[PDB]
């Protein structure tokens, strides 16, 4: 029983204040990342701010893939497998960039529904997928701080 409360912080003190930059600042992934960073105490900054001494989180391309995972006894699709990948780069001022990525998996049955109901279900699934991708992206920040020290 060597357990103890987490002494180290989630977002390293070098990244307590940082700039969030993306191709669509009003998009869903950007909103999810902004929400996740706020709950961790990170104070967001404007892209064109006057401070050239803070790390920059640059969100990249997002890919979503949906494919059949299993079939019924007549070959009809039973379940779908949904994978979203998110790429990002963290630019530490003075040092080199550090690429990170997130991959999210989601499996569900193909429930026959009306078009509106199916659209709402898919939208909810994709929104939760973005939330989990942002959560994954946040957890890679401590690995970047460790790699920066090695340099």
């Amino acid at each position: 029983c060597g357990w103890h409360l987490r002494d180290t912080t989630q977002v390293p003190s070098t990244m307590k204040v940082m700039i969030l930059d993306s191709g669509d600042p009003n998009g869903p992934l950007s909103r999810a990342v902004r929400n996740q960073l706020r709950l961790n105490g990170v104070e967001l900054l404007d892209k064109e701010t006057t401070r050239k001494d803070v790390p920059s989180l640059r969100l990249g391309k997002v890919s979503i893939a949906k494919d059949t995972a299993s079939v019924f006894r007549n070959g009809q699709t039973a379940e779908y497998q949904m994978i979203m990948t998110v790429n990002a780069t963290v630019l530490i001022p003075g040092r080199d960039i550090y690429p990170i990525s997130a991959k999210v998996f989601r499996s569900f049955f193909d429930n026959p529904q009306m078009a509106l109901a199916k659209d709402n279900e898919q939208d909810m699934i994709v929104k939760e997928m973005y939330d989990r991708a942002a959560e994954q992206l946040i957890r890679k920040l401590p690995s970047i701080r460790a790699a920066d020290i090695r340099s």
């Binding site: 409360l5 709950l39 019924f72 006894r73 007549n74 497998q81 279900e121 690995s143």
Partner: protein, 582 residues
């Protein structure tokens, strides 16, 4: 028992997006492109003769006379891409002057013209306003089934015409849109459309210690049939939360109010044939209280590999929603949501606004992770459950208290090439596993990979979630129990062999089988494929029907690009495409 063949020869298919991306090196200058060809055991010989026209730096067009032997005519595919001050869009118009198969298959129709018009648009005026158009129209209800149109969107078999205008800033969003269907007299499918729909969002945080978010929506539902009900729904949803965080833990308390107003008409055919009458005016008002908490512990794992750190992350959540009868509100857009471990903490049971189930429950979960000396996560396992203090009743619906469902997850990153994944949904009050899936994969590069699969779904779960006629049909009721295996290997330096085999252990019959070989050169590529798969039922002796397909493909590349050996393109050719999983 049924065999098919395919023979395709043509240039490597390159795509250039539906929206023009400014004149780049005069695009490619006017002129013919490399024609394609195709022969099939069903549709016989087909020929394409594309022609590219460079009308202007911002406007180009493509004319592709497609000759189909079975229909005995040429269908002209015209494509238009433009870029004006408003924005960029695409126009497509396919036209078959006369169809020979259509005359025999559909004697009632007087003319056999087949055409399809598709218009797309997009434009960001200034830097906030956004306009979108998605227009589709077809001549006959059987156009989408007959032809594999390159462009065109069909929803429930209907061609949809959708327009939308949106305004978006950092905190305020506003969007108004309308969608319509092209309904023919030979189609009886029921579908609802929003004509129009308005969405408004507003986020304002740092209001003292709280955060604030407003959401509203007004929508009008119209069905494709004259006997289904119509309604006008107005929704408002103010939210306010108090997020508190620490170095080791965090707790978030949120209060939300839901207010919805309905105005239902055309309530005669439904009311006559049903015991529960739909009310003309319905007002639904419910508050919502949610408390979420999380803590994190950590430990220096020294008895195992040194320098590693193990964490423990308990999580609990309490949700409360009052019960209000919703039997007088027809279900326009609301379906039950399937859940996984991450879905145990969701605060919604149905996807939509028509049905909002009550909730008096507490969710609990534990997640443990292992980090190496580089603070890179390698392993994580999660377990969770939901405890119901009171049955979740949605007014109508169809023991329901206590720990009913459990969920799990696992992801082990053994090495840079090995990976292992899991997942389970154990259901109490039956003492059986509802769903489960696992996978282990080794992958050196894009051409060397081996994978194993397993997917399970109990009959009880299928009966509980899927429609009612699923539990009685012999092709649905038995559930899912399937084992798969995917392999690939690049023999020599110009060859590539892939294969896949999927087996259904419940019926002791295979479900899919694939074998492909491709020989890649610096000027051309030849690919041969084979696949045996389930392709329907029999309804006489109640056995499945298999299909065998052989594919021969020749590609003319002639561009000295990267031009990989062919793997990752053949692997995604069967009815169960490969996914990375690593």
């Amino acid at each position: 028992e049924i065999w098919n063949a395919r023979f395709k020869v043509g240039p490597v298919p390159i795509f250039y997006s539906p929206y023009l991306q400014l004149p780049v090196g005069d695009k490619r200058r006017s002129g013919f492109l490399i024609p394609n060809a195709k022969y099939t055991t069903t549709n016989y010989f087909e020929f394409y003769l594309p022609y590219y026209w460079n009308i202007a730096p911002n406007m180009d067009a493509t004319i592709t006379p497609h000759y189909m032997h079975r229909r005995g005519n040429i269908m002209w595919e015209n494509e238009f891409r433009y870029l004006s001050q408003a924005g960029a869009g695409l126009m497509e118009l396919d036209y078959l002057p006369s169809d020979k198969v259509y005359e025999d298959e559909h004697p009632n129709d007087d003319s056999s013209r087949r055409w399809l018009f598709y218009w797309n648009h997009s434009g960001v005026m200034d830097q906030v306003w956004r306009f979108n158009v998605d227009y589709t129209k077809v001549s006959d209800p059987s156009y989408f089934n007959d032809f594999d149109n390159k462009y065109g969107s069909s929803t429930d078999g209907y061609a949809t015409q959708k327009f939308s205008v949106g305004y978006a800033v950092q905190n305020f969003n506003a969007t108004v849109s309308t969608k319509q269907f092209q309904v023919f007299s030979e189609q009886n499918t029921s579908s609802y459309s929003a004509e129009p729909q308005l969405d408004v969002n507003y986020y304002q945080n740092d209001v003292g210690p709280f955060d604030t978010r407003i959401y509203g929506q007004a929508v009008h539902f119209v069905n494709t049939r004259d006997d289904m009900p119509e309604a006008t729904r107005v929704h408002l949803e103010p939210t306010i939360n108090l997020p508190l965080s620490n170095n080791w833990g965090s707790i978030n308390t949120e209060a939300k109010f839901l207010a919805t107003h309905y105005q239902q008409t055309n309530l005669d055919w439904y009311n006559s044939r049903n015991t529960t009458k739909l009310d003309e005016s319905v007002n639904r008002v419910m508050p919502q209280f949610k408390v979420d908490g999380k803590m994190v512990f950590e430990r220096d794992m020294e008895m195992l590999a040194p320098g590693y750190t193990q964490t423990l992350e308990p999580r609990a959540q309490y949700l409360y929603v009052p019960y209000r009868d919703q039997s007088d509100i027809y279900n326009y857009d609301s379906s039950l949501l399937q859940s996984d471990y991450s879905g145990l903490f969701r605060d919604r049971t149905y996807g939509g606004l028509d049905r909002i189930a009550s909730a008096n429950q507490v969710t609990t979960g534990v997640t443990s992770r292992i980090y190496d000396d580089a603070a890179v996560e390698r392993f994580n396992i999660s377990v969770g459950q939901i405890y119901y203090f009171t049955e979740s009743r949605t007014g109508d619906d169809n023991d329901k208290t206590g720990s009913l469902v459990w969920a799990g997850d696992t992801y082990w990153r053994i090495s840079e090439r090995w990976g292992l994944r899991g997942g389970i949904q154990y259901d109490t009050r039956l003492d059986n596993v509802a769903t489960s899936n696992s996978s282990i994969e080794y992958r050196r590069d894009e051409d060397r990979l081996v994978q194993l699969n397993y997917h399970y779904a109990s009959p009880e779960y299928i009966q509980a979630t899927l429609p009612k006629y699923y539990s009685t049909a012999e092709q649905y009721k038995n559930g899912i129990s399937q084992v798969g295996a995917v392999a690939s290997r690049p023999i020599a330096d110009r060859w590539s062999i892939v294969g896949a085999y999927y087996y259904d252990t419940n019926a002791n019959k295979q479900a899919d089988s694939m074998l492909g070989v491709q020989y890649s050169s610096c000027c051309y590529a030849i690919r041969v494929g084979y696949e045996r798969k389930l392709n329907g039922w029999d309804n006489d002796k109640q056995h499945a029907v298999y299909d065998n397909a052989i594919g021969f493909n020749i590609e003319l590349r002639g561009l000295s690009s990267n031009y990989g050996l062919g793997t990752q393109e053949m692997l995604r050719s069967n009815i169960l495409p490969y996914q990375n999983t690593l």
